[PDB]
Structure 1
């Protein structure tokens, strides 16, 4: 059988779970009866993205046409009601986000159904290799893991208290080719260990391909700071994007080292087409920041595990900080946590 440790095997089963794929899709009111996971095509979705970008700028017959074209490519099922027309910046945003997750679900599933039936190897091992990622378990006991469990603890935001966070498994990760792609940006200053949360169904995509940035076409709504890779320094701001429910209270979250360099500090939304010369990222300024006094330097990389205090920031659209980079090579994925979401209710 597979020689990979039990917690690593569960992770691989958890990331390639066909049922979580169906269940997220069902949550998107997508109609699996007309389109089950197999019918999911990379083109079916890429073409579906195009339509959305027409609606985006076509903004009064013809819109019915675009929507009917959309809802035909991606058959939903409100059962009755007849699907909502795509006629506003809100309705198009939510649909691109859904589409964005359908891309990864297609990635996850297609990775799964590829490969030879040559079965010397245990299935779990075969699928582990498809991730192109080296994954090891960090000792609960070790100090490395004490910091991580401390970063989780002291950085829950006072206002998110709809749940509590427990660390089941800490994984140390190295995506193939990523050290080499990150290396130039190692020379950049102000490097930081930052959270990125995502739906579990996104992880076959994220491990095999890395955090990537939104393609040539997609709305800029919901992006306070444009198309990039977003991170937070408050664990709970990232955990919220895991989309864990009370019925599904266990999530996957990332800790990534990001080369922020000279940050372009913003208090309000500005899409900004280009970073100014000499700037290497954007930091949205929230009212509540991690206390600098606890900030810890680990191998030339800051860990802002300071508990949430206030900054003299006013007035700002942000409750908590936000960091965005616009080149995928500015990120080096370091840890992946399996989190436990204990809900209050």
Structure 2
């Protein structure tokens, strides 16, 4: 019957939900009859990334005749749901970014399902406990009246952007998380300057992958032009910016969001897209400069790590693509995951 706390048990049910995984796949227009969850594999996802990288090549150097072949080859590897079809042509940068996002999600979905279908079968144990052990992550409930809880709720309360007011956020549960071996992985960056506690939102169907493997970088096969600042791990200092990447809705309003310790160090500051393969020498991260930023005077420290929980003000940056800040690291070892929040989205529309 499992002795884990209810919030932890409900989290485990959420992230290992097979129907949710399938629902995510059909949202990305995949045909489950031809490419079901069980048929999903890494080498097919990687091969799909490579064909998408060929489409990236052809788009950068200019025809609908020659693109057709490349577009069709992508749909061969990843069957989409169009019947007797003629599917839409993949011929622009948006098409590359949109399919890159699909394959990112399939990578983490595959991991979740592989854990579920690997391992042993014992009906004496509660499957909640069985699935919990597969995450290799210690999850504890943070007490609502603790210090760290008050700081976390204030971060959520203060950094909800006026442009994301179609919903508001309710913190249901705060979990303290510790992935196995991540503290040891983080050790080279633990005393590095400009360490910050930043948000990462993802759809719930990625979290089994994220908690088992950590936040990963998109692989070599992936098209670097599909990612605004190249292939790294992206964070925000505004909760609503990250919360938008939960992809919640009125008929699926429960989401999950991470708080990670991110060793930014010497930030390489950028106003517009820059599809880099590596940082300039001496730089440890990229900061996408937002038009708005949390008030730097209201910065507060939690366990020696800065928490930018001030209300949004003008940054003073003029010609930028970004409304809000964005932080990217290109080495997985620069992230130490600290908390996981379960959020209720109240949509006002």
Is the TM-score greater than 0.5?
A: yes
In 2, are the aligned partners of 1:90 and 1:221 still within 8 Å (CA)? no
Instruction: Encode CA deviations 1:13-41: one digit per residue, 9 max, x unaligned.
Output: 00000011111111112111222211212
Query: Tell me, what secondary structure is at the counterpart of 1:150?
Result: helix
Q: Name the TM-score, length of structure 1 as normaliser.
A: 0.96
Deviations 1:287-345 (A, max 9, x none): 11101121101222100110111121112111001111110000000000000100011
Larger deviation, residues 26-35 vs 14-23: 26-35
Shift of 1:82: 2.4
Alpha-carbon RMSD:
1.4
Q: Which moved more, 1:205-214 or 1:117-126?
A: 117-126
Judge which range, 141-150 or 126-135, deviates more: 141-150
Unaligned runs of 5+ in 1: none
Q: Secondary structure at the match of 1:237?
A: helix
Q: Deviations over 1:234-291 (max 9, x none)?
A: 0000000011111111100000000111111222222233322221111111111101
Per-residue CA distance 1:90-119 (angstroms, 9 max, x = gap): 212211210111111111111111111134
Moved more, 104-113 or 60-69: 60-69
Higher alpha-carbon deviation: 93-102 or 130-139: 93-102
- Paired with 1:97 and 1:23, the residues of 2 have a C-alpha distance of 15
In structure 2, the gaps of 5 or more residues are: none
Bigger shift: 280-289 or 327-336?
Answer: 280-289
| Distance change in 2, residues 1:143/1:13 (3 Å) | same
Aligned residue-pair number: 345
Deviation at 1:128, TM superposition (A): 0.3
CA distance in 2, matches of 1:319, 1:259: 23
**Hey, what's the Cα distance between the residues in 1 that align with 2:21 and 2:277?**
34
* Aligned counterpart, 1:10: 10
Deviations 1:66-90 (A, max 9, x none): 3222212221113465211222222
Instruction: Evaluate the alpha carbon distance shift between residue 265 and residue 17 of structure 1 in structure 2; reply closer, same or farther with a 3 A threshold.
Output: same
Contact kept, 8 Å, 2:196 with 2:305, in 1: the verdict is yes
